[PDB]
Every structure is written in C-alpha cells, then in structure tokens.
Amino acid sequence: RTLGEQWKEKLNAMGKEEFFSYRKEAILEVDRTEARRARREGNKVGGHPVSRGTAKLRWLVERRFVQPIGKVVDLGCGRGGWSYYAATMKNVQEVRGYTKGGPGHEEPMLMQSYGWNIVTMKSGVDVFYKPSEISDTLLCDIGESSPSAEIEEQRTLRILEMVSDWLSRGPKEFCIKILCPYMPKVIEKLESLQRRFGGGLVRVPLSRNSNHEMYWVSGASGNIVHAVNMTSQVLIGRMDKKIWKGPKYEEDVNLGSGTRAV
Ligand SMILES: Nc1nc2c(ncn2[C@@H]2O[C@H](COP(=O)(O)OP(=O)(O)OP(=O)(O)O)[C@@H](O)[C@H]2O)c(=O)[nH]1
Ligand SMILES: Nc1ncnc2c1ncn2[C@@H]1O[C@H](CSCC[C@H](N)C(=O)O)[C@@H](O)[C@H]1O
C-alpha cells in the first residue's frame, strides 16, 4: 500500500489535540476574521471573499496552472469563492456556477465583487445528473472527505467520471479537485485522463495537512505518481513534531467591487 494510505491511517490514529495542531502545521493560511467579521456589517463590496476557496484558486492562477477564459463553468461552486474570483478576470466573458445546496451544503451567497454581474450560480443542481455544456474553462471543486480511504476513492472515481464528460465538450482550461489522489485505482484513471486531456496534479500549500487533495490543472505537466508521492512525503514529514510551530499567514485576496461590460 501507498505512502498516502500510510499517511491516512496515521492521520486517523492521532488524538484530537495532536490532530488539530498537526493539520495546520507549516501550511499557508489566510486570516478570515475580517471576512466573517464583515457579514453582519452588511457589506457586499469590501472585496472580502465568500470562502477560503478564492485564495486557493488565486495561488493556482497566479502560477499559470490554469488561465480562466471565455465561458467559465464552476462545478460545485458552493458559496462562490471560485466563481467570483474568475469573474474579476478580463479574459472571462461569463461565469456559470452549479452547486447542490440544501441541508448541510453551502448555497451561493450574494456578493458584489468586481464583475459579479457576469456570475450566475444555480443551487439545487446535482452535477452528477446535469447534462454537460460547452465551456472554455471548466472548474470543479467537489470532494467530501471521509476517514475511509476507500470511500474517498469511490467518491473521487465517481467525480472523475462526470468531469470527463464536461472535458469532452472542448474546454482547454481546467482545474479539478482530486480528493484522494493516492489510491491506486484513482492513479490509474488519472493517468488515462491525463493521456487524453493533458495537465497535471498540483498541491496547493493552502490545503490543510489533514487532507491529501490535489488539483488536476491544465497548466501543469509531469508524472502523477511522483507528484502524489512527493505530497504524501511532505505530509508525513510534518508529523510527530515535538514543537508545533503552526501555519504561516497570508493576506486574503481583495476582490473589490463594481461591474464590468463583457
Ligand atoms: N485523528 C483524527 N483525525 C480526524 C479527525 N477529524 C477528521 N480527521 C481526519 O481528517 C480528514 C479530513 O478532515 P476535515 O476536518 O474534513 O478537513 P477540513 O478541510 O479541515 O474540514 P473543516 O475544517 O471541517 O471544514 C478526515 O477524513 C479524517 O481522516 C479527528 O478528530 N481526529
Ligand atoms: N454532486 C454534487 N453536485 C453539485 N455540487 C456538489 C455535489 N457534491 C458536492 N457539491 C458541492 O461542491 C461544493 C464544494 S465547496 C465549493 C468551494 C468553492 N470553490 C468556493 O470557493 O467557495 C460544496 O459546497 C458541495 O455542496
């Protein structure tokens, strides 16, 4: 069994005290106090992202791992961190988000960030049963953690099934969350999908150590197995610390406000 599987079982044997110290050890982090402490203040235009997801997408975009353009489809948009971030970019003509919403899942929040006007987010949409549509940029950030690697594997495999349908419609810019990249069956489907659609897997340092999520991005390249093992080793390397030095903090993105005519 793989290093990720070993990391996983090791993650689950930890106590609560250690788990909480561990999951944010040496990771990158944005302070959300400002964001959340400007909900009741009734401010749609302070540039405060709706989620931590925006900073994740920025990290990738900044490094040219994906370059949003044209019609953007955002699968499992949730609150809209990714959809609104895309909306601020000048090559983006349209942003269409879909999320399931409902009990125990995020709905699309209203915001008035820069270019919010080209954003349409529909809740009550299970993407597993949404016919695909042509897009230029396909974003997908779906994947529910579970203590069981096997469940995350089945969940990942299921997501990789439908993503493939949307990718077959032409989008050359893409960014797909891979919940459990370290299980063998997942590696096998990913090699096949890479063979066909290109791209690579990238670890975003804003991800917590309690998860192994990697992003399949059009702007990346290289050997998946190796990329995945490198991430597993880093995650294991952060275990068993005597002194927990905590995370390193980053200023959140400023998404501004107003509209744009495209
Ligand atoms: N040892 C230990 N492992 C845990 C515990 N809670 C979760 N895990 C493991 O960590 C994995 C993912 O943790 P999450 O808490 O979902 O990760 P997160 O993104 O920080 O989630 P939120 O902070 O709840 O939004 C789970 O699938 C478990 O394998 C815990 O109390 N103890
Ligand atoms: N089958 C499904 N169909 C549509 N959305 C789903 C889904 N399964 C999970 N999701 C949604 O996918 C979302 C991922 S979290 C969305 C984060 C977003 N990128 C942001 O920046 O805010 C969750 O809210 C969840 O409700």
- 137 close to 68: Cβ distance less than 8 angstroms: yes
First to last CA, the chain: 51
Which of 70, 83, 74 has its CA nearest to residue 111? 83
Q: What is the CA radius of gyration of the chain?
A: 18
Report the domain count for the chain: 1
Catalytic: which of 25, 74, 136, 141?
141
- Structure-token match 């005519």, residue found: 261
Residue type, 138: L
Half-sphere exposure for 233 (CA within 13 Å, toward CB): 6
Closest atom of ligand 1 relative to the 15 alpha carbon: 1
Tell me, in Å, the resolution of the deposited structure: 2.3
Whichever domain contains 11, its CATH number is: 3.40.50.150
Question: What is the extent of the structural domain holding 192?
Answer: 1-262
113 labelled ligand-binding? no
The 8-class DSSP code of residue 249 comes to E
Proximal ligand: closest to the CA of 52: 2
Q: Could you tell me the distance, in angstroms and rounded to a whole number, from the CA of residue 71 to the centre of ligand 1?
A: 34
Residue type, 105: H
100 labelled ligand-binding? yes
Half-sphere exposure for 43 (CA within 13 Å, toward CB): 15
Degrees to nearest 5, angle at CA 203 with 123 and 154: 55
Q: Could you tell me the distance, in angstroms and rounded to a whole number, from the CA of residue 8 to the centre of ligand 2?
A: 23
Q: Is 79 in the pocket of ligand 2 (CB under 6 A)?
A: yes
Q: Is 99 in the pocket of ligand 2 (CB under 6 A)?
A: yes
- 156 close to 132: Cβ distance less than 8 angstroms: no
The 8-class DSSP code of residue 72 comes to E
